Design a protein around this motif. Structure first.
Motif, short mmCIF file in Angstrom:
data_model
loop_
_atom_site.label_atom_id
_atom_site.label_comp_id
_atom_site.label_asym_id
_atom_site.label_seq_id
_atom_site.Cartn_x
_atom_site.Cartn_y
_atom_site.Cartn_z
N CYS A 80 0.82 -1.21 0.00
CA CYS A 80 0.00 0.00 0.00
C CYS A 80 0.86 1.26 0.00
CB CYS A 80 -0.95 0.00 1.20
SG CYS A 80 -0.12 0.03 2.80
N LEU A 81 1.95 1.27 0.78
CA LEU A 81 2.78 2.46 0.83
C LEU A 81 3.52 2.70 -0.48
CD1 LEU A 81 5.96 1.31 1.25
CD2 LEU A 81 5.20 1.13 3.62
N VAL A 82 3.80 1.63 -1.23
CA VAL A 82 4.45 1.79 -2.54
C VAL A 82 3.54 2.57 -3.48
CG1 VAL A 82 5.06 0.52 -4.62
CG2 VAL A 82 6.05 -0.14 -2.41
N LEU A 83 2.26 2.20 -3.53
CA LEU A 83 1.31 2.92 -4.36
C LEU A 83 0.88 4.24 -3.73
CD1 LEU A 83 -1.85 2.47 -3.07
CD2 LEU A 83 -1.42 0.17 -3.97
N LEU A 84 0.89 4.34 -2.40
CA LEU A 84 0.63 5.62 -1.75
C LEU A 84 1.71 6.63 -2.08
CD1 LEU A 84 -0.70 4.42 1.71
CD2 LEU A 84 -1.88 6.07 0.24
N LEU A 85 2.98 6.20 -2.06
CA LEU A 85 4.07 7.09 -2.44
C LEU A 85 4.00 7.46 -3.91
CD1 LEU A 85 6.95 5.45 -0.38
CD2 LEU A 85 6.29 7.87 -0.25
N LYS A 86 3.59 6.51 -4.76
CA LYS A 86 3.45 6.80 -6.19
C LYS A 86 2.38 7.86 -6.44
CE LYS A 86 5.11 2.42 -8.10
NZ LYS A 86 4.73 1.15 -8.78
N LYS A 87 1.37 7.94 -5.57
CA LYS A 87 0.33 8.95 -5.72
C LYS A 87 0.87 10.36 -5.50
CE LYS A 87 -3.97 9.86 -6.62
NZ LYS A 87 -4.50 9.62 -7.99
N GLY A 88 1.98 10.51 -4.78
CA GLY A 88 2.54 11.82 -4.51
C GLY A 88 2.68 12.10 -3.02
N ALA A 89 2.75 11.04 -2.22
CA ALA A 89 2.86 11.19 -0.78
C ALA A 89 4.23 11.74 -0.40
CB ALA A 89 2.63 9.84 -0.09
N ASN A 90 4.24 12.56 0.65
CA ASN A 90 5.47 13.15 1.15
C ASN A 90 6.01 12.29 2.30
OD1 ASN A 90 7.60 14.80 1.91
ND2 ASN A 90 6.29 16.22 3.06
N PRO A 91 7.19 11.69 2.16
CA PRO A 91 7.75 10.89 3.26
C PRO A 91 8.31 11.73 4.40
CG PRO A 91 9.30 10.96 1.45
CD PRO A 91 8.05 11.66 0.96
N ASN A 92 8.33 13.06 4.27
CA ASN A 92 8.85 13.95 5.30
C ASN A 92 7.75 14.52 6.19
OD1 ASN A 92 11.74 14.07 4.07
ND2 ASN A 92 10.40 14.71 2.39
N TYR A 93 6.56 13.91 6.17
CA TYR A 93 5.47 14.36 7.01
C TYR A 93 5.80 14.14 8.49
CZ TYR A 93 0.79 14.64 9.05
OH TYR A 93 -0.29 14.95 9.84
N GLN A 94 5.13 14.89 9.35
CA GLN A 94 5.39 14.85 10.78
C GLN A 94 4.09 14.80 11.56
OE1 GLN A 94 8.33 18.29 10.39
NE2 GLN A 94 9.20 17.24 12.17
N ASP A 95 4.15 14.18 12.74
CA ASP A 95 3.01 14.06 13.63
C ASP A 95 2.99 15.24 14.60
OD1 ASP A 95 2.48 11.78 12.24
OD2 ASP A 95 2.92 10.38 13.87
N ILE A 96 2.20 15.15 15.67
CA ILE A 96 2.13 16.23 16.66
C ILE A 96 3.51 16.52 17.23
CG2 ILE A 96 -0.31 16.09 17.29
CD1 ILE A 96 0.54 14.08 19.48
N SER A 97 4.28 15.48 17.53
CA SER A 97 5.62 15.63 18.07
C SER A 97 6.69 15.69 16.98
CB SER A 97 5.93 14.48 19.03
OG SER A 97 4.90 14.31 19.98
#
Lengths: 830, 711
Positions: A80-97
């Motif tokens: 799922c993450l392979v196709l999620l990244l292909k959609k244009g996902a940013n791997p540098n996203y951050q959570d509350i912390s």
């Protein structure tokens, strides 16, 4: 054609393969409908979703504000993450912390998830709120393989978090061998300091990671302290890790001479510095001897410091006490033969210093004798105290060292001076004196030179000293502490529970409950003692019998009828010891013989007169006048009838036909009385004393007297002297108008309450107090009050009394002051 | 000095013999100085001293004013007894309590002491202040040899004390069989009455000595009650001695009938009566069926009067449920079935025209009716255990099912009048699936507030030693859990604990603190609920609304998931047991799973509305409305793997049934909603229903249980 067909096949593929139709564009609803297919990495479902969707893959949702990629990292999904990244996902996203999806994948240790996630241009320098970067999260779970490829894409391996700790510091904290090795060979600094200027080994010794430190030292670590200047070994002994100390000491041999010289410090725990050097001592016999060796001159040079009387002493003696107590303990645990003598050579120079130190002091003090004396006595007494413990460690416990005994005796007079100055020193500094009865007897007269009630709180303090949490208050009463007894067989039931109980917990607390009764309290235990007092005087058990006195009791000679008589005797000793331990009085008075037996001092002719005055009267005559000229049949042997059987008892083996003369009649009288008093009750009293001794040590109780011991058991009853005088008859030579009785009645009035009971014990030996006053006194089961008889006065003649008839014979005196001193020495001679 | 030579000789011989010879004239001194020899039985020494003394051997001393002869008797000495008695001691002297040296010899059981005392003309009828002679103490000590010797010199063998007892009765009290044999051989009375009418059999049944009773019956004892009419069998059955009962059965063939027809008494306990009945049941199979036959007429004649007449309601039905419960228990304790069949007919026939009576109620249907129903319900309730006695347990026979189903309307009518009649008289419906469900919807019409209060009353009912009022905090009941690892520590301590320990009381403690109270329990359950709702443990997932949670599907997401699922059921059962609200919030489908009814498509819409929207639309349409496409096989994707399931087992459907979509939609929803979470549901329910059985918890619907747990 219209969308009717389009929705028909979309619902057809929905009912056929769980396929979707359309996805709403609202962010919160779109994300909250797309967990389940990501739970199991359903790549077919999410691929169809991406075909028909307008939802951003970089959305924030939930209390943590995670993205869709964070679910994939947490669940371990890969497709799922392979196709999620292909959609244009940013791997540098951050959570509350600031949690990067790399961190969440690192949190679960997903090798595959981080591999493709990093492949999509993901920054590796992103840190959390606490400053933990990606590699810091990998260091928590310590997956070395994921470290290896990640640090290849990481520029700097010495990145510090907000706390200032690199990945190495936390990796060394967790004690993972492969992770710390991989970090160091990647270009990290082996001696990288933190914000507090601490080397990585500073954290290694704090957590006691022996193996991790060993590679660090073998790889070229530098021994340096922190910014505060405290060495890592100082925290390592303060961490209690003996194994880590063993690695440090062998890598740096100079630490061996360094660890032994901080033993003078007091901040570190004594029992915790015990473990560190025991472990090194037991490593080998060579290490065993040198540690015993090294402490020897340390004690020697520390003792030389104590010879400077001008310096402070409170901290010095504590360090001296600390080292010598630990010094003998290492010798006691043993090595890992002749090396015991070999280590004594470091010890013999210690004695040579110690013996020289005191003899120059002792000779100086005796010359002065022939307050600075007080402090000087205290200092060497610790030296004399240290003079014993390493004397006692020479051989297994059970006897006093003869080399100790010889040297103490030759300075006994000097030692007698110190106990004369302060009686309080005999307990803490002369605690060894309690272990040596021979020296105890010689100093007994010095201890008895202060017949004070201060000794009462001394004994209670000595008994309670050394017991952890020695407070008789606020103690919870657990179920196990409660002992259940039944009133029908209370005497036997009490024996069973105390036999199955634990001595240590019974000494600490008392909890006895009667069967069928719920009201608990301290009064119940007090009543339990009272009924036990009434049980031991009951002749049904045939354990104690009434004396000829009529108010006291003595052990029964025919107690062997009861099968459990020995068990009852030890049971009686245990409960009396507990009552004495908890300051509980007993309303039962016993004969003088019983107190003498438990105290251990031999009985005399007066003891026989307490039960058989007629026989003692015959013995009194034989010890007064000469017997050799009379030519009687005294042959150091008697013919007796016991238990209906004839018996001949020779007082001396083979000397049963030797005539008794004046010179040897002293032992002839002593032996025959001792045989008649003790032979019939010797196993009985032996079982009683050992039962009492299981809770009250014999050494501690030995400091009392027969009268003092009875007074503690009987408490301090009030004495109304004025009432006692006004209702007392007076006959037998001395009239009521005779001034002698007025002097006697004035002497008892003006003496102290302590002396009043001593006089009562001397004349009668019983602390009886009748209800409502001192009238109606019972003497020998008959109505009889105290009386005084008249006898002629001769030099060195003291009054004597017989309790059976409450009569005392008092010599004629011309003055009250003469009467008082004669009575005073009579009290002292009791 | 005075008699120098004479005193010198006395001095030397006194010390050589180790004791004095001359004795001072003081009585108090004389007695105490003579003690060390009298307990030692030093006959030669006391004889020498007494020959040189001018004292009285009858002098009284001590608390009870005892004598020297008393001391020797107490110690068991023999030879010193002769010297004292030959010197003028009176053997008949007594203490202030009336104790003569004969009693002390009897107390010590010394044959030599009593024989020599009798030789010196000692009275045998001497009694203490209580009127008790030396025979009483000998009988207590069980000295049969001494009794025979004394009875040869005792004229009155049947002497009575203040209480009226005799050597026969007191020996029976002590249970010595040898003593009573000698007494019976002496010719003493065997039916001697007490002042209250007690006989030797009166104490025989009170103590239940089988050997003593057999000897007593062998010698020819008579059967009679006391002055109050208390039959000796009453004490025997109230003492629980089946051994003596069986002996009396052999002697009296009518005893077994009398005790069985006296079973309707209420003064004797429930399990206490069962003990004697089973003792006389297992002696022989012939006796096993004989008593079963005998109790059969009692059961059917007791129900016959309940069929006909009316009496005290509590007195009547309690007696019936008392006897019938023991009648089935003794059968359960143990050709036996064949002999039971005629015994069945005694109460089955009685129940047969009860069915005829219940048929008349339908004719009447097609308040004295209510009271008849209560009597009818009890015997119908009692008839269940009769049917349960016919076969091994674990199943419900179609016999009473056939009777109840044919006569359900009157049962429904009275259940509406009194819903609580289900709890006691219909307590048997907890094991009959056919009858719980048919009465399930009928009891659903009651208000929730009344229903919940009944449920709480019966949740704590049937539990022995169940006290909820300040139970002491035992050491074992204390559970220690660390604050940091409260989830892990609580699971571990519960695993090593037992259900019974936490069922009644609860105690939670934490390291470093002594927190205790109801609030500690409340926060312990609250923190556990907060830790399970969120996916931090990866055990539950959020729903579409976001404020509701559902379980995670894939198994082994958490390695210890099965333990937590059982642990979650354990703690929630305790929360319901102690009756406090919890902050847990699950999906509606979650409550459907724990209840039992199938999950509807509305619950499916709570996760994905679009999927359920299509399913509900086609349910309202025909097979091929507007050219719809339909298939009889479905496919599901799991873990990226493509799998096919042909709906119904054995292949796809071949015929149109209910628009060809009704059951097909139901099948696909159930398969998708429970097959992926089947193992985890079972783990959860097992931990939950072990505290509250499913029968006693399925009586509420989803909404009723939600309100009582959440509030």
């Amino acid at each position: 054609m219209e969308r009717a067909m389009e929705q028909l096949n979309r619902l057809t593929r929905s009912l056929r393969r769980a396929r979707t139709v359309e996805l709403p564009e609202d962010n919160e609803t779109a994300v909250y409908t797309l967990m389940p297919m990501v739970m199991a990495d359903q790549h077919r479902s999410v691929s169809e979703l991406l075909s028909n969707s307008k939802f951003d893959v970089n959305y924030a949702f939930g209390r943590v504000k995670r993205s869709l990629l964070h679910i994939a990292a947490n669940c371990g999904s890969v497709e799922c993450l392979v196709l999620l990244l292909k959609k244009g996902a940013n791997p540098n996203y951050q959570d509350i912390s600031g949690c990067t999806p790399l961190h969440l994948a690192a949190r679960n240790g997903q090798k595959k998830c981080m591999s493709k996630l990093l492949e999509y241009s993901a920054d590796v320098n992103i840190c959390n709120n606490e400053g933990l970067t990606a590699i810091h999260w990998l260091a928590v779970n310590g997956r070395t393989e994921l470290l290896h490829d990640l640090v290849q894409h990481v520029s700097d391996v010495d990145v510090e978090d907000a706390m200032g700790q690199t990945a190495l510091h936390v990796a060394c904290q967790n004690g993972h061998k492969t992770t710390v090795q991989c970090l160091l060979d990647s270009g990290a600094d082996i001696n990288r300091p933190n914000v507090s200027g601490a080397t990585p080994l500073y954290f290694a010794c704090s957590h006691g990671q022996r193996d991790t430190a060993q590679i660090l030292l073998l790889r070229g670590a530098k021994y340096l302290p922190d910014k505060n200047g405290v060495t890592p070994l100082d925290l390592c002994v303060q961490g209690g890790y003996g194994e880590t100390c063993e690695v440090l000491i062998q890598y740096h041999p100079r630490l061996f001479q360094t660890i032994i010289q901080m033993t003078q410090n007091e901040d570190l725990r004594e029992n915790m510095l015990r473990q560190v050097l025991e472990h090194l001592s037991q490593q080998s016999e060579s290490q065993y001897l040198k540690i015993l060796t090294s402490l020897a001159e340390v004690a020697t040079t520390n003792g030389h410091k104590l010879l400077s009387l001008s310096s402070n002493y409170d901290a010095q003696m504590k360090s001296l006490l600390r080292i010598v107590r630990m010094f003998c303990h290492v010798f006691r645990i043993g090595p890992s033969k002749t090396p015991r003598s070999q280590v004594f050579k470091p010890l013999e120079l210690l004695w040579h210093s110690l013996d020289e130190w005191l003899v120059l002091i002792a000779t100086e003090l005796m010359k002065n004798k022939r307050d600075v004396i007080s402090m000087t006595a205290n200092r060497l007494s610790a030296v004399i105290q240290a003079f014993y413990m390493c004397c006692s460690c020479q051989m297994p416990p059970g006897m006093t060292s003869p080399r100790f005994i010889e040297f103490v005796c030759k300075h006994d007079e000097v030692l007698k001076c110190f106990v004369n100055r302060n009686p309080k020193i005999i307990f803490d500094h002369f605690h060894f004196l309690l272990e040596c009865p021979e020296l105890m007897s010689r100093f007994m007269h010095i201890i008895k030179a202060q017949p004070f009630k201060d000794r009462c709180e001394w004994f209670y303090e000595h008994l309670h000293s050394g017991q952890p949490d020695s407070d008789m208050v606020h103690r919870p009463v657990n179920e196990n502490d409660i002992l259940l007894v039944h009133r029908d067989s209370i005497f036997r039931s009490s024996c069973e529970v105390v036999s199955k109980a634990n001595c240590a917990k019974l000494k600490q607390g008392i909890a006895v409950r009667f069967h069928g009764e719920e009201g608990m309290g301290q009064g119940v235990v007090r009543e339990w003692f009272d009924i036990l007092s009434n049980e031991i005087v009951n002749p049904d058990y045939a354990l104690f019998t009434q004396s000829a006195d009529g108010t006291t009791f003595q052990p029964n000679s025919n107690s062997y009828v009861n099968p459990d008589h020995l068990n009852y005797f030890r049971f009686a000793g245990q409960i009396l010891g507990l009552a004495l331990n908890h300051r509980q009085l007993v309303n039962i008075y016993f004969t003088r013989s019983f107190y003498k037996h438990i105290l251990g001092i031999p009985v005399n002719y007066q003891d026989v007169a307490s039960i058989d005055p007629e026989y003692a009267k015959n013995l009194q005559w034989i010890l007064d006048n000469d017997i050799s000229d009379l030519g009687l049949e005294l042959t150091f042997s008697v013919e007796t009838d016991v238990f209906g059987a004839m018996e001949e008892v020779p007082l001396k083996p083979g000397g049963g036909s030797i005539l008794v003369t004046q010179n040897n009649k002293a032992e002839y009288v002593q032996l025959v009385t001792e045989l008649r008093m003790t032979r019939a009750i010797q196993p009985q009293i032996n079982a009683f004393l050992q039962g009492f001794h299981m809770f009250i040590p014999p050494s501690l109780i030995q400091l009392f007297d027969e009268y003092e011991l009875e007074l503690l058991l009987s408490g301090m009853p009030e004495i109304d002297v004025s009432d006692w005088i006004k209702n007392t008859e007076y006959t037998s030579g001395y009239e009521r108008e005779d001034p002698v009785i007025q002097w006697f009645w004035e002497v008892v009035e003006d003496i102290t309450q302590e002396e009043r009971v001593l006089l009562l014990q001397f004349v009668t030996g019983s602390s009886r107090v009748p209800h409502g006053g001192f009238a109606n006194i019972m003497g020998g089961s008959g109505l009889q009050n105290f009386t005084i008889a008249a006898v002629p006065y001769t030099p060195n003649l003291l009054p004597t009394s017989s309790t059976c008839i409450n009569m005392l014979k008092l010599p004629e005196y011309p003055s009250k002051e003469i009467l008082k001193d004669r009575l005073l020495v009579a009290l002292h001679c009791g």
